[PDB]
Amino acid sequence: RRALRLGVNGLPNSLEPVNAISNVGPRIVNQIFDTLIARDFFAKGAPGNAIDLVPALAESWERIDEKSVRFKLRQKVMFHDGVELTADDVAYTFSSERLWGPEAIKKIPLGKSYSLDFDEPVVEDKYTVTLRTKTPSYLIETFVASWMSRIVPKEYYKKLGAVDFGNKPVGTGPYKFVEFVAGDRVVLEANDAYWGPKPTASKITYQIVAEPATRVAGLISGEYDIITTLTPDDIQLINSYPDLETRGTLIENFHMFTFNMNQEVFKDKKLRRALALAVNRPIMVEALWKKQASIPAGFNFPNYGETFDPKRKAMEYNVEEAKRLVKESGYDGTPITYHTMGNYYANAMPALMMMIEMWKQIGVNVVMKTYAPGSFPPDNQTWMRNWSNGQWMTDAYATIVPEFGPNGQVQKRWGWKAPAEFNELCQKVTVLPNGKERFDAYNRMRDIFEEEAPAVILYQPYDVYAARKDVHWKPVSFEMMEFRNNLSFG
Ligand SMILES: CC(C)[C@H](O)[C@@H](O)C(=O)NP(=O)(O)O[C@@H]1C[C@H](O)[C@H](n2cnc3c(NP(=O)(O)O[C@@H]4[C@@H](O)[C@H](O)[C@@H](CO)O[C@H]4O)ncnc32)O1
């Protein structure tokens, strides 16, 4: 076969599937690992956005009650080291020890905050395991199809520890691990024992090319087969080449900017709300995205299904109100830093430049502070910063509760003093079934989020890739790359 060469925007700090949840991690861990349930993005001729759930490591599954789903596992599946996958590896994957228990915080910092209210799994036999929650939860199924639920080998994982495992991953996926050089590359090779639609590449290299211009020059050279994290501003040049083309889709993710609310200037919602009210998203969508970005009506997305509100109003744009709020705040005109890891997010630096001018017009002075990967300063040294959230469930629970809820990093690490009402509705939605009460609680949470402005939603980016026309691969509507039945050459 042919070795696949990818020019990427970045690499994760770990290949441990939960510690790799990011914009740059899933495109690699999707190859090394498998989930029990998988999403079939290409079902019924869909352009990589189908929401269909198909069996993967679990040949079948059945909800027993409001707290548990029994999985019947595929037999003779092998981990990359020849160890057979059993219900024991599945129990360990979702165990208190490895993922949601108090001890797990040390190994997987965000594991507990991103997990459901789990109870210990029950192994029925070598190929049957029941995944359980201590309280009623109809979210088990979407969680098991997610980036939180890639299956790890119990013995090898325990032998190495979560940290050492992140540097030498072992999974059941189509590509086995070969090498990980931090700040340089990840090399994978075909797992010809995949259970499993056969890998079509002999090797895959994820090479960091932090500058998008060097990434485009690389594809034209051509040092790469496919490049990631481009901007619609690159579309005309790449598409003029006869052997090159762009492939892009709107993904189930939103770009945003957030604050360190532990800082004096961001303790009260007034200056956060003023900055949010001056963000002119429609011009940013023209200037930078060429109409290829979607401004959502709040923390509300179609993939939420029954908890998506299609009648919700757009987020407010009000420069006069923003001006008044800056005057009403204790802000004195002192510069505020906004940290960004270059263009890790597409259009991050041109978006900040545009917003800096919008903010200067309402009386706020924002300065760009750029930083290299691995050099993010202590929390204490940061004020504003960009971020993104992948909506990883077919429900509104993610990501408002895992990220912005009472037990999340935005309140616990970044200092958001959320109102009591916001945290009460977070608990209610987690345990209430779908209905009038749960739909309304999410809307009231969305209304609270906009007034509080702990983060400011910008848009759903159109994820732009560029590839050699002789590399047949289609983007999916998520921050990952899929090669199963979606990769061929010539
Ligand atoms: C281990 C330490 C001892 C060590 O020194 C070092 O590793 C360190 O500094 N660690 P620290 O904790 O300070 O991590 C730093 C702190 C800072 O906030 C930054 N950051 C966090 N999420 C990031 C991200 N998310 P993303 O947008 O690509 O991916 C998101 C993901 O964050 C999110 O959880 C998920 C679901 O909403 O959506 C993805 O889209 N993209 C780029 N930067 C990110 O990394």
Residue numbers in the entry: 32 to 521
Quoted passage from the original study:
To our knowledge, the best known system that exemplifies this paradigm is the antibiotic agrocin 84, which penetrates into the cytoplasm of the bacterial pathogen Agrobacterium tumefaciens strain C58 by hijacking the PBP called AccA and its cognate transporter. AccA also plays a key-role in the importation of the characteristic plant tumour-derived compounds such as the opines agrocinopines A and B discovered in 1981 in crown gall tumour tissue. The mature AccA structure is a monomer of 493 residues composed of two lobes, each formed by a central β-sheet flanked by α-helices. We identified the pyranose-2-phosphate-like moiety shared by these two ligands as the key recognition template for AccA.
By the molecular replacement method, we then solved the structure of AccA in complex with agrocin 84 at 2.15 Å resolution. Overall, the ligand bound structures are very similar (average rmsd value of 0.33 Å over 490 Cα atoms) adopting a closed conformation. While Agrocinopine A is fully defined in the electron density maps, the leucine-like moiety of agrocin 84 is mobile. Notably, the electron density maps of agrocin 84 show a D-glucopyranose connected via its C2 carbon to the N6-phosphoramidated TM84 moiety and not a D-glucofuranose connected via a C1-linkage as previously suggested using analytical chemistry approaches that were available at the end of the 1970’s. Our structural work showed that the toxin agrocin 84, composed of a glucose moiety linked at its position 2 to TM84, is recognized through a D-glucopyranose-moiety, whereas only a furanose linked at position 1 form had been previously suggested for the structure of agrocin 84. Moreover, in addition to their pyranose interactions, two of these major residues Asn54 and Ser419 also tightly interact with the phosphate/phosphoramidate groups. In contrast, the sucrose moiety of agrocinopine A and the TM84 part of agrocin 84 make only 3 and 2 polar interactions with AccA, respectively. The sucrose moiety and TM84 occupy a different position in the binding site.
